[PDB]
Design an enzyme around this catalytic site. Structure first.
Site, PDB file in Angstrom:
ATOM      1  N   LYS A 215       0.837  -1.178   0.000  1.00 24.20           N
ATOM      2  CA  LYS A 215       0.000   0.000   0.000  1.00 24.20           C
ATOM      3  C   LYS A 215       0.875   1.232   0.000  1.00 24.20           C
TER       4      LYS A 215
ATOM      5  N   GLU B 242       4.201   5.765  10.949  1.00 22.54           N
ATOM      6  CA  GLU B 242       4.855   5.063   9.860  1.00 22.54           C
ATOM      7  C   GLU B 242       6.320   4.790  10.189  1.00 22.54           C
ATOM      8  N   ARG B 243       7.039   4.291   9.190  1.00 20.83           N
ATOM      9  CA  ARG B 243       8.421   3.875   9.334  1.00 20.83           C
ATOM     10  C   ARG B 243       9.370   4.962   8.853  1.00 20.83           C
TER      11      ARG B 243
END
Lengths: 51, 479, 504, 478
Positions: free
Chosen positions: B161, B187-188
């Protein structure tokens, strides 16, 4: 005719096994329905100390 | 002068004691000044959650409370947080507080916009839906965008995604000359640093040409607090109003992780003592995502085209996140973990990604008729596939097996390569134009490359390129 | 203050009568007003900053949980049977310090930064904050580096990344720590500081792998972080932050370094017990919400730092437990949300004999060939989805009967690949040997070979190439590039040992 | 002058007690009501001081039944963890959970009493050898090699004859292990406890004459026990076992059941305690409690603790957090199927589902783990084959598929062998099936040597020779 009959017999026995596995699956399904209800009960229970 | 005493510290939940009369409004900015671990006065920015009462109030923190002894003074500034907005962000990786994550020059804070600003009027919206093209083959095939609307991704885990959005971001962002606005939230730092690198590399962060930069970054990654993870979507919305309301451009709004954005205040409601809703749900999270989506609106001023993305929670569709999101998004994309189990990247949920602009009125009865036949075969393929795995491909009739061929094929030829994907994939990505694959799917349901393989359809760009791959694999089968 | 005003009566309400029209500060000593089972509600210590240790009057470090109004809930790090009611916990002030240097490397450290090994106190003079902050995206470089799993299927499927954050989902006795153990053996030549974190494992088995790591000498590269299950969930839940502090000591020491967190699902239940030990509102399987964030507070500590941050590789190795592999667990859901790419296993395949049992379609590289050597990232670069698709067709095959030349050919190539996945338990390869096998199967020269022959044939291929093509070993090594000189050397000695093994 | 607090509040075996405001007893301090029955002064309320509630009051786990307990009765607290008649005094003595004789033998010598809330054996202090332990039972030898000095457990649903397989295990290992044996009936159906006492007598593991030389001790808390009674009964069993493993430094043959019932007791106990029950019914305390249970169960260097325990694996939910939480802390959990007893295998272990730390070629022998992996993947393929076998039947299957199917069917049938004491239900005198005869039988079966012998002939057939004779009987039967 032997091929036609043995195919027919295999499909008949398969239908028997099928409705059997259906009952087992729906049994576990409603068991899981109770499980989802139990998780709901757990969510209810935390509210009892909460609000 | 309305100083707060930090009454009680329960996680991001803070009981504060502002003065009796001088207890501020809702969504109030406050700043608990105190000795840091540096000992320097860190001012903790925080939002008025709710009036606990008796001059004490519940408040979510934005900073970390680690070091908050009680009774500590808090500048209740009183109002919604004013984000440094406009082109000042365009180039700036802002924090959720708008602080420069980019180690950039500080934003023009003269631009400043209150955080929980309301949502627009049905009158005030621009009112024509438009196919925003993708470069993404089966995406644009299966569903056309309403440009200016809500691009929604109900997401699997590590789904790509990210990747789907990223290639889409590349394509539409070079295409749409609006200032892109990426929000990497929950998030990362690996993934987000890749995003910033590929936005500079995509010229839109424009590390030289800062503020000739056609993109902004909002940063809300999962290392931030949940109250930080709560608020940041509205900050994105405020920058969105500055560019689509105020700068009035056809706005580009990448927004994720929306399920984490749920998950934070979802987690914080019990921290607020707001009662237990569903399986992780906060109670009025329905209304919360409703303000999110309603705030995400193409005004008559600018078209707020909005890449929104939530983790489809453990692929549970009835899970209250995507359940609430279903009315929210305009064009929506579940992916298929079956197609990811088929290994597709893009792994589009072939029956299960729909669009407002999916219509013969909208896409054309060419496109809608083609997809009618296409999804028809795909659905009966999924249908008869059960009698396949029970009854074998020998059990297939004529048109059924032709459809089965069509299924595995149009599956594979529906899979395209992203130039984004080329390390996790390793393939050259083709920005697949739409009518090319309209021709290819017309041919696939026409059974033209039924001669060819689905191996020869697997992750390719053109139906001509598919026939070329058929030529390649045929000559390799000679070898 | 239904709890406090009850036991306030003897002293603190007598104090409240004593100090009513009076505004006071007992703001250092929490006389331990209420206390239960590691959780205390100590009256006072209001000026204790949040996160501080609390020097309990008997001697215990109460961990700062929640500042209620009158008392405060504090988490005892220790066995607080010692403390009596109203014990004046002094606020110990040091808010999650961590005695941090390289001193604990080569020592099985206990959770207190003390050695569990009995190798004496690691003279670790720095104090990294145990609750450390995390690596920013600006502070991140991209993980350009490849990390050496040694699991050639893993580094084939999912590229191990220096700095990166993978999680291993598994099974009750996956023995997943043994995969980590051989990784540490792969890390034993990798110039990486190594951490073997151990939450609630069998301390017997912890000593078993500790002996195996000592015997391996990865325990030279490793410290062992250890908190077995009978200890405090203070320690159990918290200890990941301690390993992160030691890692950030090595990583702000800019090193390639990697950690192996033995199940935080244990730590998940531990903090679940902490939450109910707070008597707070818990949720999905009695987790709080924040545990995911706490997992996030665990997870994003480990990144490829920027070169401004020193390019310090802080690579992460989680092995999250999972009930029978049920991904829908909020534990598993948060972890699936957390680690950028993750290692799903399927110990069905361990019961099928794949030891490693990499659930290949389910295991995930979010990163990809960026953390692969360009030799390997070239060589088996299209091979991961190839094995996936060979599995996919072979999945689509047992429904059918008459396997066509394309069909049976890809099935032969894939069954060959599946045996070619089968590296034995601690049968690590050089990425030379790994990508050597990858070029064998990638040039298809053993799609000919039968898998019974191919196992030992690849072994003899590996040994012959260890002898005959050590130049090619240094080629794939040195150039990091499977050059056509090297790939030709590969095909060359491949034909050579193909003769030598068809000879066999 | 120990504090005789009043009985502050009483609901369940958690009683509140108002100690002196200075002198509150310790956490896990024992206590005793001054106590009564109608019949005199039954002072029997020894108590585990759970939580220092405050206002001089504290909630506590009374180790007995709570009738007649007057609110305000003076409990003199022992101020200390409960000490039990540990050591060889218990050897012979069926000890109660109270340390009293549940045998109604003589009151044992109180020289070795012990605080069961005790430390765990250190990682320095633990022994570390991966020695296996011999079984005599088929998959118990083979698949999960039971490790010497370890908490080998058996997770099983109710009505497994976890009783039965545990008792056959007791019968074999008891005569086998010259180490000291300690059995903990814990919530047990003490009909079977009486069976066990009769059996120890019958074995001489209660050498009734020279009751000191029984050399196997009983610690029983019956089903009728209260939960706080059922709480630390295992702790007392572990304490006397620790006298065996440290004081005596003997090899601790240590069987105990049911740990899941122990968890259920702690669950309802914390339900009494006023603490929020974390799991489906389980306490939050369950984790570190079962860890403390397994942590005393460390095989010490002085005496390694071959601790066979059992999980009443409830509802066939492995993902029940009880069995989940157990699956870590055990070293070798024999997973007992309900289903193989619907197939009639006694024992009904899903050997597929069980797992050994001891399972290695380097550990078991490469021949053993090789043939073991062969049989294991035979089972795995058989289970995979069952899916298509179910609806369609085997006529659609392949002939190699039928070859593997009947082969692993033969493997499953030969895995059925009788158990030694198991006759009392069935009638068969079991064969103490050694590991190598089992190895040869596996060799014949998977190698298809036994593929002319019949599957039904291998059913409850101990040796492959015994299978050969049974098949000779069947092939004689015409």
């Amino acid at each position: 005719a032997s091929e036609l009959a043995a195919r027919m017999t295999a499909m008949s026995n398969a239908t028997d096994n099928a409705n059997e596995l259906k009952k087992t699956l729906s049994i576990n399904y409603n068991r899981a329905r109770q499980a989802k209800i139990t998780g709901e009960i757990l969510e209810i229970v935390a509210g009892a100390n909460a609000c | 002068k309305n100083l707060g005493r930090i009454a009680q510290i329960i996680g991001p939940v803070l009981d504060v004691a502002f003065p009796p009369g001088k207890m501020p409004n809702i969504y109030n900015a406050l700043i608990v000044k105190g000795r840091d671990t540096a000992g320097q006065p860190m001012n903790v920015t925080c939002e008025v959650q709710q009036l606990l009462g008796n001059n004490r109030v519940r408040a979510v923190a934005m900073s970390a409370t680690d070091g908050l002894t009680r009774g500590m003074e808090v500048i209740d500034t009183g109002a919604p947080l004013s984000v440094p907005v406009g082109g000042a962000t365009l180039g700036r990786i802002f924090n959720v507080l708008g602080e420069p994550v980019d180690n950039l020059g500080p934003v023009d804070t003269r631009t400043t916009s209150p955080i929980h600003r309301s949502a627009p009027a049905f009158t005030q919206l621009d009112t024509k839906l438009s196919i925003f093209e993708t470069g993404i083959k089966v995406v644009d095939l299966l569903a056309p965008y309403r440009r200016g609307g809500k691009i929604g991704l109900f997401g699997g885990a590590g789904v790509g995604k990210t990747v789907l959005i990223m290639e889409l971001i590349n394509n539409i962002a070079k295409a749409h000359g609006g200032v892109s606005v990426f929000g990497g939230v929950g998030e990362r730092t690996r993934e987000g640093n890749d995003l910033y690198m590929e936005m500079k590399e995509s010229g839109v962060i424009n590390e030289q040409n800062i503020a000739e930069s056609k993109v902004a970054l909002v940063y809300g990654q999962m290392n931030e607090p949940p109250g930080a993870r709560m608020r940041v979507g509205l900050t994105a919305l405020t920058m969105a109003e500055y560019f689509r309301d105020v700068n009035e451009q056809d706005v580009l709004l990448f927004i994720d992780n929306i399920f984490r954005f749920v998950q934070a205040g979802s987690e914080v409601s019990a921290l607020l003592g707001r009662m237990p809703s569903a399986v992780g749900y906060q109670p009025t999270l329905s209304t919360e995502m409703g303000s999110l989506q309603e705030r995400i609106t193409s005004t008559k001023e600018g078209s707020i085209t909005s890449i929104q993305a939530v983790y489809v929670p453990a692929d549970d569709l009835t899970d209250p996140a995507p359940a609430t999101t279903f009315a929210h998004l305009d064009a929506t994309t579940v992916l298929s973990r079956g197609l990811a189990a088929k290994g597709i990247y893009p792994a589009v949920d072939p029956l299960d990604s729909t669009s407002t602009m999916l219509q013969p009125r909208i896409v054309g009865e060419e496109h809608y008729e083609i997809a009618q036949r296409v999804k028809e075969t795909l659905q009966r393929y999924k249908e008869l596939q059960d009698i396949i795995a029970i009854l074998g491909l020998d059990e297939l009739s004529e048109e059924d097996r032709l459809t089965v061929a069509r299924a595995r094929k149009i599956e594979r030829f529906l899979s395209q390569p992203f130039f984004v994907a080329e390390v996790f994939t390793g393939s050259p990505g083709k920005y697949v134009g739409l009518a090319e694959t309209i021709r290819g799917f017309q041919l696939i349901l026409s059974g033209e490359l039924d001669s060819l393989p689905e191996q020869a359809f697997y992750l390719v760009g053109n139906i001509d390129e598919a026939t070329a791959k058929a030529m390649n694999l045929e000559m390799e089968s000679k070898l | 203050m239904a709890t406090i005003r009850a036991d306030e009566i003897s002293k603190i309400i007598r104090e409240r009568i004593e100090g009513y029209n009076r505004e006071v500060k007992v703001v250092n000593t929490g006389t331990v007003l209420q206390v239960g089972d590691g959780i205390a509600r100590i009256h006072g210590l209001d000026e204790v900053m949040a996160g501080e240790l609390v020097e309990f009057e008997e001697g215990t470090i109460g961990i700062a949980l929640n500042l209620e109004s009158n008392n405060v809930g504090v988490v005892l790090m220790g066995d607080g049977l010692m403390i009596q009611e109203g014990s004046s916990v002094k606020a110990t002030g040091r808010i999650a310090q961590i005695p941090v240097s390289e001193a604990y490397l080569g020592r099985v450290i206990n959770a207190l930064a003390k050695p569990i090994d009995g190798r004496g106190e690691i003279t670790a003079s720095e104090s990294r904050l145990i609750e450390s902050p995390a690596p920013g995206i600006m502070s991140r470089r991209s993980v350009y580096e490849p990390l050496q799993t040694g699991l050639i299927a893993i580094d084939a499927m999912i590229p191990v990344g220096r700095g990166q954050r993978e999680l291993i989902i598994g099974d009750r006795q996956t023995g997943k720590t043994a995969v980590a153990t051989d990784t540490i053996l792969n890390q034993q030549g990798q110039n990486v500081i190594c951490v073997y974190v151990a939450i609630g494992q069998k301390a017997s088995s912890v000593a078993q792998v500790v002996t195996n790591f000592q015997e391996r000498g990865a325990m030279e590269y490793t410290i062992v972080v250890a908190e077995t299950a009978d200890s405090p969930a203070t320690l159990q839940y918290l200890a990941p932050y301690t390993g992160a502090a030691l890692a950030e000591y090595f990583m702000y020491r800019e090193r390639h370094t990697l950690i192996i967190y033995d199940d935080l699902s244990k730590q998940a239940q531990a903090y679940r017990q902490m939450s109910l030990l707070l008597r707070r509102p818990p949720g999905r399987e009695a987790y709080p919400g924040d545990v995911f964030y706490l997992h996030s507070r665990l997870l994003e500590r480990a990144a490829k730092l920027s070169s401004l941050l020193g390019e310090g590789s802080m690579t992460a190795l989680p092995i999250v437990e999972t009930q029978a592999g049920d991904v829908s667990a909020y534990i598993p859901t948060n972890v699936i949300s957390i680690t950028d790419g993750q290692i799903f296993l399927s110990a069905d395949l361990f019961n099928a004999g794949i030891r490693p049992a990499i659930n290949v379609g389910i295991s995930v590289s979010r990163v990809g060939s960026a953390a692969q050597i360009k030799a390997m990232k070239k060589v088996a670069g299209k091979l991961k989805l190839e094995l996936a698709q060979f599995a996919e067709l072979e999945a689509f095959a047992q429904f059918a009967s008459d396997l066509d030349k394309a069909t049976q050919n890809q099935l032969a190539r894939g069954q060959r690949l599946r045996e070619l996945l089968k590296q034995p338990q601690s049968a690590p390869l050089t990425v030379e040997e790994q990508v050597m096998t990858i070029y064998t199967g990638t040039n298809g020269y053993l799609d000919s070979l039968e898998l019974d022959q191919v196992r030992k044939y690849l072994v003899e291929l590996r040994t012959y190439v260890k002898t005959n093509k050590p130049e090619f070993q240094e080629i794939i090594s040195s150039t990091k590039t499977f050059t056509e000189e090297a790939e030709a050397l590969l095909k060359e000695a491949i034909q050579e040992q193909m003769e030598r093994f068809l000879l066999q």
